[PDB]
Amino acid sequence: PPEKPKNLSCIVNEGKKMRCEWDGGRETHLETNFTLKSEWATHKFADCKAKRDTPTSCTVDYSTVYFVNIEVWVEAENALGKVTSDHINFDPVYKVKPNPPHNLSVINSEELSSILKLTWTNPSIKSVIILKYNIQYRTKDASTWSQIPPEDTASTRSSFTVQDLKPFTEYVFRIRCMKEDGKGYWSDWSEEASGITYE
Amino acid sequence: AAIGSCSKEYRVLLGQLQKQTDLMQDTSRLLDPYIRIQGLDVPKLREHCRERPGAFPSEETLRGLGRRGFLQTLNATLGCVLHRLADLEQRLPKAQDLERSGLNIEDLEKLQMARPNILGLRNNIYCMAQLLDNTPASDAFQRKLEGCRFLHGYHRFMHSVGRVFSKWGESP
Amino acid sequence: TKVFPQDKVILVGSDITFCCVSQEKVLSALIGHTNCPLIHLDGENVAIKIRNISVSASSGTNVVFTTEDNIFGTVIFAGYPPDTPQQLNCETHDLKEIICSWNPGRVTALVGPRATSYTLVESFSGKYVRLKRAEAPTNESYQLLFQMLPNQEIYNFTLNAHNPLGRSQSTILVNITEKV
Numbered sequence A: 001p002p003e004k005p006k007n008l009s010c011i012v013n014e015g016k017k018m019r020c021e022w023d024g025g026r027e028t029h030l031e032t033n034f035t036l037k038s039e040w041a042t043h044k045f046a047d048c049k050a051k052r053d054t055p056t057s058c059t060v061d062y063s064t065v066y067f068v069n070i071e072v073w074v075e076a077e078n079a080l081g082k083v084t085s086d087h088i089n090f091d092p093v094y095k096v097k098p099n100p101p102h103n104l105s106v107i108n109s110e111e112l113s114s115i116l117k118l119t120w121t122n123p124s125i126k127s128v129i130i131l132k133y134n135i136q137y138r139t140k141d142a143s144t145w146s147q148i149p150p151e152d153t154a155s156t157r158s159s160f161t162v163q164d165l166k167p168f169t170e171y172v173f174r175i176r177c178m179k180e181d182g183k184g185y186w187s188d189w190s191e192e193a194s195g196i197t198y199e
Numbered sequence B: 001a002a003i004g005s006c007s008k009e010y011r012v013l014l015g016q017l018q019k020q021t022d023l024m025q026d027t028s029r030l031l032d033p034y035i036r037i038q039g040l041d042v043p044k045l046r047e048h049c050r051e052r053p054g055a056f057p058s059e060e061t062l063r064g065l066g067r068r069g070f071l072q073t074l075n076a077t078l079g080c081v082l083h084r085l086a087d088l089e090q091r092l093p094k095a096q097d098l099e100r101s102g103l104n105i106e107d108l109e110k111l112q113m114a115r116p117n118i119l120g121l122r123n124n125i126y127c128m129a130q131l132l133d134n135t136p137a138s139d140a141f142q143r144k145l146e147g148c149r150f151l152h153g154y155h156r157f158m159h160s161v162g163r164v165f166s167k168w169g170e171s172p
Numbered sequence C: 001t002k003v004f005p006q007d008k009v010i011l012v013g014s015d016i017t018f019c020c021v022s023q024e025k026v027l028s029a030l031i032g033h034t035n036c037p038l039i040h041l042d043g044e045n046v047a048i049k050i051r052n053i054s055v056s057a058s059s060g061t062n063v064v065f066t067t068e069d070n071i072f073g074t075v076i077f078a079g080y081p082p083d084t085p086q087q088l089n090c091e092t093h094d095l096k097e098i099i100c101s102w103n104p105g106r107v108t109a110l111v112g113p114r115a116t117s118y119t120l121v122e123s124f125s126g127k128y129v130r131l132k133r134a135e136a137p138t139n140e141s142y143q144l145l146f147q148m149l150p151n152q153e154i155y156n157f158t159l160n161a162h163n164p165l166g167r168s169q170s171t172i173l174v175n176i177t178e179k180v
């Protein structure tokens, strides 16, 4: 006889359906078909079925609606009985995993020999929620990646200036972003962009 | 089983309502895809897409309404909008048709995403109300203009309801 | 009504003459994006000539007549005759029903309540089957089921298609026993 699962968590990508995962538990040599119920306060959505390839993950068939508390729970059943996991409710806007800012470019200035200007393009989520960034840079020959303090990049923007890089060296940059309040998941690192300071 | 109220926090509920209205207030999101898909992307033709008087309630009436009749009229108007939007979606073309023509599927995606947005807004209005607890035949060219005017009126109503929600900040 | 004709189905490439009756003066007339000169008639009525009309979209190349106060217009549908059904084959799985597969061929560029209705009819028995508005993509080559008639093996099917512009047919003789 199997036992109830746990470790339930759900993640929402940019403009896609919400997937959820759980744990397998102990093995009982008996076939088990997993299913999780998702419902609003008034609307009862469809159900998943644990595929034979991956019995701990499904992709729902309904479009995601933000700012609406949805209640999700998994019910495990077999030939010997059924049992339901715990019930949690969460705003789907708190589980969003945005995309990395694309089109990164580095432009210098012919007036000062210690500054660099960073430009990028934010995804479409910037219109829904406020987001923050983390700007990491390093020298061309130095493999260690330094990080700019996040206190300067705690709001949405599309430009930033680096400082204190005096003599004629090349630098590579990268940036990621997530929700402002820290709730959610950090995006992937953007493409590395190079730039040479002024002489 | 299923909870009667989806949440019990007045503050986060009001925040969700305000964010929903401010998001659904997007003419560029809803109306413009319709004008683009119906072939009316010509300046003079787009100039005639104006709301007719008496289509949706007025800002003065929404301001005069209280906290219960306001939610009731909002629910009724959303129901009527859902009906007319189902009619429109029945009238809209298909994805392969749009591909063969040269239009953008993003319009169909935005419509099929805007309908569940209305459903969720109705759900949230129900949650807030529970938490409180105190033309025989028309022409093929006239139908397009009627739909455009209806969408413009809906956008005006969304702006009005968003301003009304943003008016009352916090209360017990 | 102010513009004539209304919602007419025409063949791609033929000429057509529109007309608008109105008491007030008309300023200009457009066909989608393209403009066309007006031909004055008796009174304030104007007419326009269209030659070698291109393929119209689904919504239709709606010709509009713009005045100083309002706007009037209609919709025209330019389409093609229906193509002859191609690659017609029938086989059986349990000797109870016959499924006949075919390809629609070249697209007719007409959709809505004007699509090509398909109807398969039997010669020896006169029985026919008609397809409903549910239309599958060409990706899944078209099919229609036909109940097998008891104590009969030879079958001679003829498929017929028809749109508001033309019709086409195809004939096949099959031995239902050698198609399992």
Ligand SMILES: *[C@@H]1O[C@H](CO)[C@@H](O[C@@H]2O[C@H](CO)[C@@H](O)[C@H](O)[C@H]2NC(C)=O)[C@H](O)[C@H]1NC(C)=O
Pocket: B072, B075, B076, B079, B125, B126, B129
């Ligand atoms: C909002 O309007 C609806 C009208 O559609 C009212 O009626 C509810 O409709 C839903 C449709 O899914 C039913 O599930 C409910 O059972 C209906 N409720 C009743 C009481 O008939 C609904 O009551 C309205 N909500 C509020 C809060 O007034």
Ligand SMILES: *[C@@H]1O[C@H](CO)[C@@H](O[C@@H]2O[C@H](CO)[C@@H](O)[C@H](O)[C@H]2NC(C)=O)[C@H](O)[C@H]1NC(C)=O
Pocket: C122, C123, C156, C157, C158, C169, C171, C173
């Ligand atoms: C197969 O059935 C058809 C009727 O559907 C028979 O009649 C022929 O129909 C075609 C139309 O596609 C005509 O061109 C022929 O002239 C018709 N022939 C006759 C004799 O009427 C057809 O004969 C049947 N085939 C066989 C081999 O019997």
Ligand SMILES: *[C@@H]1O[C@H](CO)[C@@H](O[C@@H]2O[C@H](CO)[C@@H](O)[C@H](O)[C@H]2NC(C)=O)[C@H](O)[C@H]1NC(C)=O
Pocket: C153, C175, C176, C177, C178
């Ligand atoms: C249609 O197919 C059936 C069987 O698939 C054919 O019937 C066979 O005829 C041969 C004689 O040539 C016999 O030896 C077989 O025993 C028959 N098979 C049966 C009865 O199952 C029939 O001749 C075919 N018709 C045509 C016109 O070719």
Ligand SMILES: *[C@@H]1O[C@H](CO)[C@@H](O)[C@H](O)[C@H]1NC(C)=O
Pocket: A007, A008, A009
């Ligand atoms: C699931 O278990 C992992 C470690 O096994 C740990 O992150 C935590 O206990 C659970 N994760 C979540 C997101 O609840």
Ligand SMILES: *[C@@H]1O[C@H](CO)[C@@H](O)[C@H](O)[C@H]1NC(C)=O
Pocket: A031, A032, A033, A077, A078, A079
């Ligand atoms: C899944 O497993 C359960 C466990 O007995 C079984 O009853 C059911 O038939 C299986 N299939 C489906 C589709 O539920």
Ligand SMILES: *[C@@H]1O[C@H](CO)[C@@H](O)[C@H](O)[C@H]1NC(C)=O
Pocket: A102, A103
């Ligand atoms: C970057 O910008 C260019 C033009 O400014 C355009 O292709 C697109 O917006 C972006 N492309 C990529 C690959 O990021």
Ligand SMILES: *[C@@H]1O[C@H](CO)[C@@H](O)[C@H](O)[C@H]1NC(C)=O
Pocket: C052
């Ligand atoms: C119509 O135009 C097409 C291409 O624009 C041309 O190939 C065709 O010959 C024209 N037909 C006539 C009758 O002018």
